[PDB]
Tab-separated table of C-alpha atoms and ligand atoms in Angstrom:
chain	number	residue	atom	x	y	z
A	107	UNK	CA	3.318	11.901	21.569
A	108	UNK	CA	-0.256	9.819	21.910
A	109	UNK	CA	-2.819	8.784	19.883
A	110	UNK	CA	-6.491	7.901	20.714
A	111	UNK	CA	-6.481	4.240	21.554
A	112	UNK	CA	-3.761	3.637	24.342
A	113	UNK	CA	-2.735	-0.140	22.909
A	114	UNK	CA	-2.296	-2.773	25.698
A	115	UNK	CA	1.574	-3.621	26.130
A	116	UNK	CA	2.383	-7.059	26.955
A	117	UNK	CA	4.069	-6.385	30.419
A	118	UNK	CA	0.922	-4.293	30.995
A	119	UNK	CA	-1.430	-7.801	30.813
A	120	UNK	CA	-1.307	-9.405	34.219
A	121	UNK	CA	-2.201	-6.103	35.891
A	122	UNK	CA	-5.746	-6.339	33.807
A	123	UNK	CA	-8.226	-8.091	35.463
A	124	UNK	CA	-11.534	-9.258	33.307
A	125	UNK	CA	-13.205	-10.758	35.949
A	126	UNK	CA	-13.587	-7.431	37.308
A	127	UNK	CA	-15.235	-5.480	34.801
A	128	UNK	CA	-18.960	-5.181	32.660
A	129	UNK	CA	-19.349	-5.609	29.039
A	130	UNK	CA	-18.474	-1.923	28.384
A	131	UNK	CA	-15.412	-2.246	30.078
A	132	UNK	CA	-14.124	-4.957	28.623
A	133	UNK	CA	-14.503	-3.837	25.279
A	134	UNK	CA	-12.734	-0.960	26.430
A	135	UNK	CA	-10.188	-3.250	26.901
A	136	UNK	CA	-10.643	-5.129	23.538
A	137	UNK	CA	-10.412	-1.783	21.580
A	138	UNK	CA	-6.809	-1.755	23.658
A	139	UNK	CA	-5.323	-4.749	22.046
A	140	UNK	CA	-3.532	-4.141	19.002
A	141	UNK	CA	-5.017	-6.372	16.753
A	142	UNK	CA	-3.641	-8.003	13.497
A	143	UNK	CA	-6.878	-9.029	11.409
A	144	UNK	CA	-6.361	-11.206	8.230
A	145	UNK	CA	-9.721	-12.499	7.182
A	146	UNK	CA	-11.970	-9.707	6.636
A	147	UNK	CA	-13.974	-9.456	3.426
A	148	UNK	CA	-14.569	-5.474	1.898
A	149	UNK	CA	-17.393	-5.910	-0.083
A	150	UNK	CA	-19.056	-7.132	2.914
A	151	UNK	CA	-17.812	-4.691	5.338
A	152	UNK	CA	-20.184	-1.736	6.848
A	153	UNK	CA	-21.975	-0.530	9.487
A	154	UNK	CA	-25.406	-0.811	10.144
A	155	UNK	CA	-25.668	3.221	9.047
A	156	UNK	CA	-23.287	3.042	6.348
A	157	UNK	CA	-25.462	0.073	4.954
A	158	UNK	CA	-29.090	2.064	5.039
A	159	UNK	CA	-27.439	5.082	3.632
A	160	UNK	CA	-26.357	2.817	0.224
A	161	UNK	CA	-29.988	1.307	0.105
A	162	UNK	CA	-31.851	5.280	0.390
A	163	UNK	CA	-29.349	6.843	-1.647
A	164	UNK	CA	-29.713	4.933	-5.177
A	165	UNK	CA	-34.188	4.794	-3.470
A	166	UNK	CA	-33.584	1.206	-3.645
A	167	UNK	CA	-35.987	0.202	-0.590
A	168	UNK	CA	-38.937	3.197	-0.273
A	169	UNK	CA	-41.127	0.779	1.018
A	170	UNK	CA	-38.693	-0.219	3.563
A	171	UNK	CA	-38.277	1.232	6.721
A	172	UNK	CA	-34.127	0.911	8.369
A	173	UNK	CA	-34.675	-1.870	10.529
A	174	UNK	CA	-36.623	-3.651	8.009
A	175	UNK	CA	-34.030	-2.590	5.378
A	176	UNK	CA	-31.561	-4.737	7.869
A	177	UNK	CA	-33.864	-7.437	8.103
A	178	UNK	CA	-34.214	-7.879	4.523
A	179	UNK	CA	-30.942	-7.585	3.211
A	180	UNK	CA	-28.095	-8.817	6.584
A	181	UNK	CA	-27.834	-12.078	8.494
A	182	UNK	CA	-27.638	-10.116	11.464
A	183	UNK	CA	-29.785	-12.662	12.918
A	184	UNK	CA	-27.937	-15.747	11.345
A	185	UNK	CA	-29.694	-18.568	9.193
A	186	UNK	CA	-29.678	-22.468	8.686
A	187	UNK	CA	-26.051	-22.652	6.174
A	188	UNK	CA	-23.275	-21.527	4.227
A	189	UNK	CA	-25.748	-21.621	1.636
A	190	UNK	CA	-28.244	-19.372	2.729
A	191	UNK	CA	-25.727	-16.754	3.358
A	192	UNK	CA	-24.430	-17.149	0.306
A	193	UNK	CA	-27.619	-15.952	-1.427
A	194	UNK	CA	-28.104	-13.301	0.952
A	195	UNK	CA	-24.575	-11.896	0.142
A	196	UNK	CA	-25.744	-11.497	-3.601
A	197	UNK	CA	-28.746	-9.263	-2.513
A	198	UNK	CA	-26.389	-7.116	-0.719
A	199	UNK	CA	-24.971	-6.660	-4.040
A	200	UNK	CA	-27.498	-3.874	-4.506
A	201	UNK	CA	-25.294	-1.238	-3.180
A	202	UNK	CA	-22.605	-1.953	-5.683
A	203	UNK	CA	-24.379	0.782	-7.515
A	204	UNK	CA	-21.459	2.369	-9.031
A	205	UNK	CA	-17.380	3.423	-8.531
A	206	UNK	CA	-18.210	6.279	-5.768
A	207	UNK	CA	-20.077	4.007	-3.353
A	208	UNK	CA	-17.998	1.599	-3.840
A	209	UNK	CA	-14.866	3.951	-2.728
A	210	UNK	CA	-17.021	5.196	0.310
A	211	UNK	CA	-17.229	1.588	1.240
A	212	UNK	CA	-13.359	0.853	1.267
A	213	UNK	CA	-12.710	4.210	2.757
A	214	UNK	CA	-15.477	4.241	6.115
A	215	UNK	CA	-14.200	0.025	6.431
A	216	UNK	CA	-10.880	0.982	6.875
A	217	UNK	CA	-11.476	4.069	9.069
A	218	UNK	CA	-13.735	1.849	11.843
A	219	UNK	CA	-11.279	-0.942	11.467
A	220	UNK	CA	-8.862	2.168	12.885
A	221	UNK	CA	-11.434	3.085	15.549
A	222	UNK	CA	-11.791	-0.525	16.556
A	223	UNK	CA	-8.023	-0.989	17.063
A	224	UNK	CA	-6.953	-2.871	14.843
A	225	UNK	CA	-3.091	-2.249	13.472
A	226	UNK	CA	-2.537	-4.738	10.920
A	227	UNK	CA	-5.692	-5.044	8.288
A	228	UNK	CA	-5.946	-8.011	5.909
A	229	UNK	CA	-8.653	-7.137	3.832
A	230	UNK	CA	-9.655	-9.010	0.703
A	231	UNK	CA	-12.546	-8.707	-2.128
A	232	UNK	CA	-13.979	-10.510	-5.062
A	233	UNK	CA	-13.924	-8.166	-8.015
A	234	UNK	CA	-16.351	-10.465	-9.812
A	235	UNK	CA	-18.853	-10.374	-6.920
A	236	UNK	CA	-18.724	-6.341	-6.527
A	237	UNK	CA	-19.049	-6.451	-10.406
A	238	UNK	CA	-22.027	-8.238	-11.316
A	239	UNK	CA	-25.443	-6.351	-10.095
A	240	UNK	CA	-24.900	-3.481	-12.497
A	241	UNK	CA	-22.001	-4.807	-14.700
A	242	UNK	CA	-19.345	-2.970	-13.371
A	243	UNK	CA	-15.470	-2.774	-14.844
A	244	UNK	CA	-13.465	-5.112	-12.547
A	245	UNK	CA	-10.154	-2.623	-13.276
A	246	UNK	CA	-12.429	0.835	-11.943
A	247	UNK	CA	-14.149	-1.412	-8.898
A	248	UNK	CA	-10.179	-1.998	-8.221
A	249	UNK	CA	-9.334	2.066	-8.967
A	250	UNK	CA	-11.974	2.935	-6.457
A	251	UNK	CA	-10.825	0.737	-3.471
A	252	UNK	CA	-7.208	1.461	-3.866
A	253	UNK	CA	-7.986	4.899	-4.258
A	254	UNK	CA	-10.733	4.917	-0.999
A	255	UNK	CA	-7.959	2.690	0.874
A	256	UNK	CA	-4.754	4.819	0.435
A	257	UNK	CA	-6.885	8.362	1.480
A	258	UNK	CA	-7.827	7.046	4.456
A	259	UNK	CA	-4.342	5.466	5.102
A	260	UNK	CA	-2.613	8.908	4.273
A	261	UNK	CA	-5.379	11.150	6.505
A	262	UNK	CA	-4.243	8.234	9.741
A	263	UNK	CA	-0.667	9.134	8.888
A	264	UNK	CA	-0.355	5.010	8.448
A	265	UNK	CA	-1.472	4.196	11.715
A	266	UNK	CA	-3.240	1.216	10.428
A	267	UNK	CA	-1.755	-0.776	7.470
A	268	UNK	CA	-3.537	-2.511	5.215
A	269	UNK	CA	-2.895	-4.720	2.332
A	270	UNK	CA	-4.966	-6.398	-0.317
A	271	UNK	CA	-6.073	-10.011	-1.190
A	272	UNK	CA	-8.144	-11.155	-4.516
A	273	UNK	CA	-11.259	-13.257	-3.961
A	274	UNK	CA	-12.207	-15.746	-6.712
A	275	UNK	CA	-15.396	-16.965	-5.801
A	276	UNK	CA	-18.314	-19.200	-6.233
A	277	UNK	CA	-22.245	-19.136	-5.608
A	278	UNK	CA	-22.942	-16.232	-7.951
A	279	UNK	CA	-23.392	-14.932	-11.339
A	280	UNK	CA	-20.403	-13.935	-13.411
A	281	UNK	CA	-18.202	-16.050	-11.133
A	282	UNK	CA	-15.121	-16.970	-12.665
A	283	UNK	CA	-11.959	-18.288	-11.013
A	284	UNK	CA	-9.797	-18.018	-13.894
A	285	UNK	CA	-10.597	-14.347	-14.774
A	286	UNK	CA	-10.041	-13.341	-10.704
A	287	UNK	CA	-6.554	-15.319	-11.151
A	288	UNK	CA	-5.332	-13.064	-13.995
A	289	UNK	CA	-6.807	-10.299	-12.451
A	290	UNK	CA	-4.821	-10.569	-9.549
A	291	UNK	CA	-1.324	-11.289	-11.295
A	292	UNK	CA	-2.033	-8.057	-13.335
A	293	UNK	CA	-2.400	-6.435	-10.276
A	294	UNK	CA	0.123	-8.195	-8.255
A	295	UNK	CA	1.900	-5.403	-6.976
A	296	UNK	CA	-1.870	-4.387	-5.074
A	297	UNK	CA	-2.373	-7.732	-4.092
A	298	UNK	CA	-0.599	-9.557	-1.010
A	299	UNK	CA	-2.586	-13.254	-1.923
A	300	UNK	CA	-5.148	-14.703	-3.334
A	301	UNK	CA	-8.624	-16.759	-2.123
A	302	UNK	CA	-11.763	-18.948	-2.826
A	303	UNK	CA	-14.660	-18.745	-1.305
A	304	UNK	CA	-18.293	-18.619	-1.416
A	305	UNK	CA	-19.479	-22.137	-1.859
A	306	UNK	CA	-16.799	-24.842	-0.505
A	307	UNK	CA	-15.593	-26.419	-3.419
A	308	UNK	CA	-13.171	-29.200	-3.715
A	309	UNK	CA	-10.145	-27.060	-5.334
A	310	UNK	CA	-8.162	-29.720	-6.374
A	311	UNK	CA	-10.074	-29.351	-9.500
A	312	UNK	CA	-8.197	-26.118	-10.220
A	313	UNK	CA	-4.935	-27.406	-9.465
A	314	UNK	CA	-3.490	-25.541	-12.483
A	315	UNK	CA	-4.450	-21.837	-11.802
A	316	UNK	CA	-3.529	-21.852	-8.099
A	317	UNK	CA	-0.588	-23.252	-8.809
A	318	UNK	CA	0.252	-20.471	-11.427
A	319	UNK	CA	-0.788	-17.683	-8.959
A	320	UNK	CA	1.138	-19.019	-6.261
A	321	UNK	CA	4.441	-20.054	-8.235
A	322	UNK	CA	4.113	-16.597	-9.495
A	323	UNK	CA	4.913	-15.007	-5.987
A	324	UNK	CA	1.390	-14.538	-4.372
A	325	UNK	CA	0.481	-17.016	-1.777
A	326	UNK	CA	-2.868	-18.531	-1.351
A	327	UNK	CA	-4.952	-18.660	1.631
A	328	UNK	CA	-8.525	-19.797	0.709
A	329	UNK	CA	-11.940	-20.855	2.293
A	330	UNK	CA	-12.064	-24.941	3.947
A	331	UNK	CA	-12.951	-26.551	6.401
A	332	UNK	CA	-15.956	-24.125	7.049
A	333	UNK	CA	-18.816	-25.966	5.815
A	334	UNK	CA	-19.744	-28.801	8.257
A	335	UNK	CA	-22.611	-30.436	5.919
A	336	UNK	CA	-20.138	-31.552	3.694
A	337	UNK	CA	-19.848	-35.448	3.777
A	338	UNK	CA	-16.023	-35.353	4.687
A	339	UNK	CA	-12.887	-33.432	4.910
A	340	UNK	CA	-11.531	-33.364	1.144
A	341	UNK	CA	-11.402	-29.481	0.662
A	342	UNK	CA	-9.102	-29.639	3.631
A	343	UNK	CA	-7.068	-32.123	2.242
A	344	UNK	CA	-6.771	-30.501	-1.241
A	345	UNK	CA	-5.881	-26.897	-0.083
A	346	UNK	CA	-3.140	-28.261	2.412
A	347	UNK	CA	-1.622	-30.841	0.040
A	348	UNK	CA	-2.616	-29.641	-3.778
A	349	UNK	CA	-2.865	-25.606	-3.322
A	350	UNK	CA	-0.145	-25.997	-0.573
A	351	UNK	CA	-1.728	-23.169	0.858
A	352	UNK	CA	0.418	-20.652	3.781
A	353	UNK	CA	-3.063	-19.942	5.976
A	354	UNK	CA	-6.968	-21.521	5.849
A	355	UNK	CA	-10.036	-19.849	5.769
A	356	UNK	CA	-12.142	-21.039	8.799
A	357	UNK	CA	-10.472	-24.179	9.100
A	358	UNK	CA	-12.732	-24.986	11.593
A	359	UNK	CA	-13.170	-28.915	10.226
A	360	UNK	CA	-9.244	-29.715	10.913
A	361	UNK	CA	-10.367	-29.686	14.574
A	362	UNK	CA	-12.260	-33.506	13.931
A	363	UNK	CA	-8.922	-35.240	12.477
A	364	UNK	CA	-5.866	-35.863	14.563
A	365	UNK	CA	-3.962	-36.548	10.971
A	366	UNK	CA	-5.009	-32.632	9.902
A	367	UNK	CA	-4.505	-31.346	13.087
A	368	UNK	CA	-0.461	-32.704	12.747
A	369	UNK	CA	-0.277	-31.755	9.021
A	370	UNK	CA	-1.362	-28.093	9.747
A	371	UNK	CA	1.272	-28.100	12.679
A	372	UNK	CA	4.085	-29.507	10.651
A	373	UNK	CA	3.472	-26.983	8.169
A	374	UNK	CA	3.277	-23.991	9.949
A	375	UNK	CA	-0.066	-23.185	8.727
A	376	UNK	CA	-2.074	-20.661	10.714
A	377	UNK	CA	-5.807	-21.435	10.651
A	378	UNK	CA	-8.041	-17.498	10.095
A	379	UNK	CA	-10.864	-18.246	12.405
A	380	UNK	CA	-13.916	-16.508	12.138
A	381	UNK	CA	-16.359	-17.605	15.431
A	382	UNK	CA	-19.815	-15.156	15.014
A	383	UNK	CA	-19.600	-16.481	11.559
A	384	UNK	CA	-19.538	-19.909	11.843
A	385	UNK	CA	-22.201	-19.870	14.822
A	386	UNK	CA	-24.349	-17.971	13.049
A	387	UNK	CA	-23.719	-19.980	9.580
A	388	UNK	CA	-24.211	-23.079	12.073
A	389	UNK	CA	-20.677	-24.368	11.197
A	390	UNK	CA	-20.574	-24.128	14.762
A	391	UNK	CA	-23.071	-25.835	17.331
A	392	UNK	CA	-22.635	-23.297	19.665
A	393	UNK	CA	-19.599	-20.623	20.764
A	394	UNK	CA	-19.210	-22.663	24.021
A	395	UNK	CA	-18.492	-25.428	21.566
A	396	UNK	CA	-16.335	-23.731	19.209
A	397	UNK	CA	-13.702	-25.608	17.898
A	398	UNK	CA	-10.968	-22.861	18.066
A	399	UNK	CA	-10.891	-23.679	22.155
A	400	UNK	CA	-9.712	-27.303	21.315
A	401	UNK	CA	-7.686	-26.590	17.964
A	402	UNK	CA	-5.667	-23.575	20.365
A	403	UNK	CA	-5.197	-26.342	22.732
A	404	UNK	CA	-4.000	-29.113	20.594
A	405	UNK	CA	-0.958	-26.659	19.280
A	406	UNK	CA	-2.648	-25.148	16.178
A	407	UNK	CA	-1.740	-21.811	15.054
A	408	UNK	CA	-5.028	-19.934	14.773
A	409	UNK	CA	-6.123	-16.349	14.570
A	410	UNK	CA	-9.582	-14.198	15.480
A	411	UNK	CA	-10.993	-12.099	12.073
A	412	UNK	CA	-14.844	-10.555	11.920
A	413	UNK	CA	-15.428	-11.646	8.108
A	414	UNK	CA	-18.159	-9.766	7.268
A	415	UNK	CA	-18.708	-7.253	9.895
A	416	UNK	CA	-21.400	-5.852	7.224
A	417	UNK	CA	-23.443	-8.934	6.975
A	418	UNK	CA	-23.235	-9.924	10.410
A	419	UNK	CA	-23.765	-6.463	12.097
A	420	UNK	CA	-20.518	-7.042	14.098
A	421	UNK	CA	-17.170	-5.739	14.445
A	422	UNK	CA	-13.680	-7.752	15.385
A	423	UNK	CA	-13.863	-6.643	19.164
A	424	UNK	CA	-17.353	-8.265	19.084
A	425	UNK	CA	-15.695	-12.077	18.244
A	426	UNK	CA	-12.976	-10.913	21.065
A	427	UNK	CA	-15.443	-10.519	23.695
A	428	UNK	CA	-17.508	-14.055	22.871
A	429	UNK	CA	-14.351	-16.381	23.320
A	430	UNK	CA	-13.618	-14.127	26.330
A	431	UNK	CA	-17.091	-14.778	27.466
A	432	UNK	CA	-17.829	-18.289	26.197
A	433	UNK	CA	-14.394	-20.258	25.826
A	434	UNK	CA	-12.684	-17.938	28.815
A	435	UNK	CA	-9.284	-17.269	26.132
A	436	UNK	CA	-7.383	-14.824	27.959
A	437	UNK	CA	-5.115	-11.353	27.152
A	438	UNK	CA	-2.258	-13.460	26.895
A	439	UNK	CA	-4.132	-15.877	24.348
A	440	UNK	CA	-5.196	-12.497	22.154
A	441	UNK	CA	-1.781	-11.178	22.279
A	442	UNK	CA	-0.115	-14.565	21.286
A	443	UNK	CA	-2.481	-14.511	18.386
A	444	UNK	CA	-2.563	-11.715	16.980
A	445	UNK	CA	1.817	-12.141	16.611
A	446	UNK	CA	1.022	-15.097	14.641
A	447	UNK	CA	-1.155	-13.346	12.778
A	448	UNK	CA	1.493	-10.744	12.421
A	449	UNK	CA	3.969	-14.011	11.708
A	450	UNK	CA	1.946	-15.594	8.876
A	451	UNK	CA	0.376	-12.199	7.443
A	452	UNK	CA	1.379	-12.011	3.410
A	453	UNK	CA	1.543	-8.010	4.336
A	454	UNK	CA	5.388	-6.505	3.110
A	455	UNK	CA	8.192	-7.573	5.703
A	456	UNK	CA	9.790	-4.218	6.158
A	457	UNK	CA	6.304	-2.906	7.015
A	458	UNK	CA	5.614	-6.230	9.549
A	459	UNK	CA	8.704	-5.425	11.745
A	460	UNK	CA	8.056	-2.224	12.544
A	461	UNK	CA	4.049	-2.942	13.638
A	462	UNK	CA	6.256	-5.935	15.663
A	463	UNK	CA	8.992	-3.024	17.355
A	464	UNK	CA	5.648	-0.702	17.780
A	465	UNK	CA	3.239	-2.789	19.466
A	466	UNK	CA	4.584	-6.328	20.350
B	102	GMP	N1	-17.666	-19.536	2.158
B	102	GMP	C1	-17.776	-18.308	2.657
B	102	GMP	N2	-17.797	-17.224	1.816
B	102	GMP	C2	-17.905	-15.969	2.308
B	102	GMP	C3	-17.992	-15.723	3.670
B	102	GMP	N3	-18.090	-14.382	3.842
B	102	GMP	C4	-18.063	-13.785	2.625
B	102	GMP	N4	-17.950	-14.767	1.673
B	102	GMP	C5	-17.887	-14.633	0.214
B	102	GMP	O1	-16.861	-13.757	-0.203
B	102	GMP	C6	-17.296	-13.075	-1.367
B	102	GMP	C7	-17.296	-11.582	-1.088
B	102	GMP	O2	-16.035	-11.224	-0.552
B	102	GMP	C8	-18.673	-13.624	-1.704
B	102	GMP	O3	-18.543	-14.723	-2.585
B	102	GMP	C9	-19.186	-14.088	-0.365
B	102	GMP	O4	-20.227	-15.048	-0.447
B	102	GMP	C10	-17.974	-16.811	4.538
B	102	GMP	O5	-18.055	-16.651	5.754
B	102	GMP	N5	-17.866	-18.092	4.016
């Protein structure tokens, strides 16, 4: 009985030496690791190929050659902000032509997530933002990725699980936090928690719906502590303490107060770290000076995610190899991660215990 990717056991780890091998045969060894991801956004997940197929199928680019078409559309490249991606993200949009595409898209993120090696997929959309371009039905966006997720699922004979979380989001038209909050308690039994992101808002100001969702048995696990141009740390503040969120988006921030850093500890709250991202948003100075490397060393539960592997022309083995590379975290480092990923993961318990008895 074997199946393509031989995972890494963890008895198996001190006989693998990094400092031995080349790029390709590390990520040989990143592929290996059975990775639990839990911040990984849908609508902005695709290949390169995937992506330029979308664009010349609906002849939305002519003019366009591929690479240009990735130039145009990605931030492959990165850019100055939060901000700037932001508005990016909506011209991406484009693709979200109708209810088959949109399927495809769920369906070839999964599988790759499955080539990549990763076990335990977190994924999460905003129906509002997939909705908007062509003014889309919100319950047949839902249909399509359910239905694109659970084929794929079924064909890998579960070999990957995934579960669902609902975006509500802000930065673009038709955005409505509200409307994504009912949304996702209609469609509770799909959804494993629910988010904010986009722009960084101060959330506190919506005290009433995120209480709702999460006294209605959906925890919440949304974007702070990303955005470093904002003139303090009151989104941090406000998730922990008003949305008395289970898990942070980024979280990046807590790293520059000793009072958040303890809070986050105390409350067992695991911190979804996205590095590519933030360097290339410029939340981060650099991936030498990443704050994951001193939040992991100050006690801080934190995992690795790819966030949008689409936008950034990435996948999750890619942010693997540049802490490897740039921050020197180790096999054991990955491993402990990715349990408390497993740990804090809103995924069904039953289902967590046996991807614990299978791989860790
Ligand atoms: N704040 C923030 N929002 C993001 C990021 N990646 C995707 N999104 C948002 O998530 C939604 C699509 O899932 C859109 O509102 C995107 O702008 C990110 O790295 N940071």
């Amino acid at each position: 009985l074997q199946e393509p990717i031989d995972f890494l056991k963890k008895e198996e780890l001190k006989n693998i030496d990094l400092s031995q091998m080349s790029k390709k045969e590390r990520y040989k060894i990143w592929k290996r690791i059975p990775k639990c991801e839990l911040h990984c956004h849908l609508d902005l997940c695709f290949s390169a190929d995937f992506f330029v197929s979308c664009i010349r199928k609906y002849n939305l680019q002519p003019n366009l050659s591929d690479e240009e078409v990735l130039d145009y559309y990605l931030f492959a490249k990165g850019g100055k902000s939060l901000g700037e991606f932001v508005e990016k993200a909506i011209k991406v949009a484009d693709i979200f032509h109708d209810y088959e595409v949109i399927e495809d898209l769920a369906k070839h993120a999964v599988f790759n997530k499955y080539k990549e090696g990763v076990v335990l997929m977190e994924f999460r959309y905003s129906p509002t933002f997939v909705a908007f371009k062509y003014n889309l039905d919100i319950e047949l966006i839902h249909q399509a990725i359910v239905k694109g997720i659970k084929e794929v699922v079924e064909l890998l004979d579960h070999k990957i699980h995934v579960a669902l979380m609902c975006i509500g989001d802000t930065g673009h038209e038709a955005a409505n936090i509200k409307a994504s909050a009912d949304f996702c308690l209609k469609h509770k039994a799909d959804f494993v928690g629910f988010d904010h992101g986009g722009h960084e808002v101060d959330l506190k100001e919506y005290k009433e719906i995120f209480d709702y969702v999460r006294e209605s048995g959906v925890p919440l696990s949304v974007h702070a502590g990303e955005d470093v141009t904002l003139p303090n740390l009151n989104t941090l503040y406000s998730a922990i303490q008003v949305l008395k969120v289970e898990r942070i988006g980024h979280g990046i921030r807590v790293a520059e107060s000793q009072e958040l850093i303890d809070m986050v500890k105390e409350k067992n709250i695991l911190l979804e770290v996205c590095p590519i991202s933030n360097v290339l948003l410029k939340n981060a100075k650099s991936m030498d000076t990443h704050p994951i490397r001193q939040l992991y060393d100050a006690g801080v539960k934190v995992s690795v995610n790819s966030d949008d592997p689409g936008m950034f022309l990435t996948n999750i083995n890619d942010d693997y190899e540049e802490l490897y590379t740039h921050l020197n975290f180790t096999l054991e480092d990955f491993m402990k991660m990715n349990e408390w990923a497993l740990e804090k993961s809103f995924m069904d318990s039953n289902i967590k215990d046996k991807i614990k008895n299978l791989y860790f």
